[PDB]
Assembly symmetry: D2
Homo-oligomer: 260 residues x 4
């Protein structure tokens, strides 16, 4: 018999990378509310302290670690520390990332490479670090935060689009290579999500008009819109969903757009 | 605050077309277990009686109706009857369909047209019949049962593939046209699902070997694998998922295949 | 050794359905210029006479036939007539189609069905009618005119989107079922193409602004933009391209759009 | 009036990276036969000498340069040298690449990063180096050699799949960012192509059986199958094709497979 318990993360441990604020924090918060124990990392103590205080305020006892996602030795040590202090990571969400907006021909090789390293190579490093214990546990979930840029390009975001396109295919590869070992690796592809940074574009705006017209749902998304889909992909309720990119965009990728 | 209640269908009414047995019955059963009131139709009383007895045995008081999905007048009358006797349909699953396996050049125009009428035109008819009350209710869900044939072709299944390809795009269109009115229209694309009919292909088999090799998960799917994804798409937990085809295939569509 | 002769259609016969004017006429004209003998059909003598006069003015001796693409008996007889009078059809372009713009819930079941019959069932009928002689000839090409609506939905075009989505999958199915017999079946998916009908939307316009912003190439497409891709798919130069939808859209489907 | 001259590369210069042998050499050879002047690079003099001798034997006066594609300074200098000695690069084919086959959890971070650097970062570097002169010339083409791994994953090829997935999206981004400047950036996605290396898998074989069954065309592809599609994408005949991945796979990506 089906049970709604299939969506529950009770007794599972989730690592959400870079989950000190923003989308990662919202996903980790939903995970805790679904029953999970939350672990997270970020690049410095200041960010970790910020995440810890915010989890506490939401009634969550998270476990926070200082670690650079591009540092394999660092991540390996972090996983080992998490396993001794908290337990086996059942669920990994590759959320950490950066974006840069530079015309392609103006972007330095170093800058391009840095975006690739953080947004693509690092999810490989963290996945590699968690998979062996997931196999031994008999079940694992890896959720890669992709983008609409996993599908569509735009001026100024060449490196970001390249890395997210790579992350989409990395997702499908891990699914193929480890699905047999009961690892489900999927993507979440958020639409246009209203963050603190895009707030002036909503001032009582042509950019706001642009987004609303592109979106059948006729609104910006919010971090809260990602919570249900994220919990779904982390849960037993999605055990036969594998190598799939779940777009959460209010219908953008399905829509030609609202024409005048 | 996120809550697992977002996955609950409590107090909602779901119509699952052709849900007397098989995949539709399994989805409707999960819906009931998630809190929904179940209504379903099929082409004759014998099938309806079969579904009713099976729902009863599972502790579900379903409401069953005799109706041909290709009969617009019939479906319109059925919805009106459902609304007077049960209530407003919150969730429609377009599950009813047929398959034929005929080499294309050997298939009659009439046979091709019949597969198109049932598998494509009928989901349009039923969607059209439920959408006006969903808009007035302030929320609706339409879940279209697609296929891997919404993506990939195969000898002998030209009509079926054409209709399911159409259903994929119908899904994206409804999402675009009605998303503004808070209708989420999505697809479920099952992988290779083990039905009563494919049982001899699992006899202690080259076809069995074929499927397992194509599937990262290394097994046939089962109707039970569709239950969580179906409940997800019918629930508040997927409100910003729209015009999306959710493939539930253990990783098939993501995999090049297991080579020797 | 590769030769540019691989793009030549010299000594081949092409049937382009509904090619009396518009996109089909432009494709057929390019085919003739590439060396092909052109045959075409349309629903009445007036349209056939129009196409014939226009081919003549362009220095092309086309062969025109009155036939409804939804009439299997009619199409069968037409192919037989073409084979006796002109020769074996080497290349079929399924170009004939209609579009309707009606809100979905307002569209009659009859109207929806008519769009499906012409835009989806008819390409099946014509393909079926030409394939047996292509197999016997040792090579065939079928080019299905799809749309951006084979990928993306829009208010008012539910039936059209459904049929073109179906046509995309029909294309992939024929490729799979007949590729072994050296039939290559592909799609052409035009972007926004400037037709006589959209001319007021280019008056010295917000709709014009909409299109240009969606298109990396920063212009409407023209029928002429389809000529090279169409000749490519009809030629020996694309013999290992099969079940593929070739989008000719200046970059629309690849682009998130020009934001303000 | 359409002309077959639209497929001609007469008076154009093409740079094909790593085109000393294999797929790149075959594409460059077709380009020369289509009228182009051929320039190419490779990592050492031995490979350059090999390519030069092979071009000469085919009646082609190619221009060969020693350069590492991951060396931005090196590539920049190479382009400058090409422009002084040969002329402006009209067409870039990003063909250079490597593949590694290592289980993901066994692959070193350094090895993963090297595959990404060569197969993804390097196409960015070379594209960046050629685009400014293409803009000034008033027309440019960039053709990225992708893979079926731009779409589908497989055990042992995680890094390769990630890089090719990235290259697919880089292609779409360049299309979006530079399409306005009359740059068409597209992909070629070869299917299973019979190379010297896979020859024992064709010995009079289960792997051979695997490929043939996956392929509607019922054969391995050959480098020659890529020549027409490559010339197409480099030519005026594809000017409104942009951000598109042209799969040349005999129908593989369209096919569910030949079941027993």
């Amino acid at each position: 018999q089906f049970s709604l318990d299939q969506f529950s993360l009770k007794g599972k441990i989730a690592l959400v990378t870079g989950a000190s604020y923003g989308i990662g924090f919202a996903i980790a918060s939903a995970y805790a509310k679904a029953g999970a124990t939350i672990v997270f990392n970020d690049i410095n103590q200041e960010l970790v302290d910020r995440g810890m205080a915010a989890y506490k305020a939401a009634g969550i006892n998270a476990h926070g670690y200082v670690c650079d996602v591009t540092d394999e030795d660092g991540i390996q040590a972090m996983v080992a520390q998490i396993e001794s202090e908290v337990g086996i990571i059942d669920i990994l969400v590759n959320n950490a990332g950066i974006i840069r907006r530079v015309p392609m021909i103006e972007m330095t090789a170093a800058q391009f490479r840095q975006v690739i390293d953080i947004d693509l190579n690092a999810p490989f490093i963290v996945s590699k670090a968690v998979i062996p214990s997931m196999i031994k546990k008999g079940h694992g979930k890896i959720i890669n935060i992709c983008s609409m840029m996993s599908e569509l390009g735009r001026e100024t975001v060449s490196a970001y689009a390249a890395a997210k396109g790579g992350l989409k295919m990395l997702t499908k590869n891990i699914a193929s290579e480890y699905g047999e070992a009961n690892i489900q690796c999927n993507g979440i592809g958020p639409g246009y999500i209203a963050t603190p940074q895009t707030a002036p574009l909503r001032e009582l705006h042509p950019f706001d008009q642009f987004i609303i017209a592109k979106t059948p749902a006729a609104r910006w998304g919010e971090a809260e819109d990602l919570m249900g889909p994220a919990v779904f992909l982390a849960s037993d309720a999605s055990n036969f969903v594998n190598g799939h990119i779940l777009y959460v965009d209010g219908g953008i990728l399905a829509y030609i757009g609202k024409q005048p």
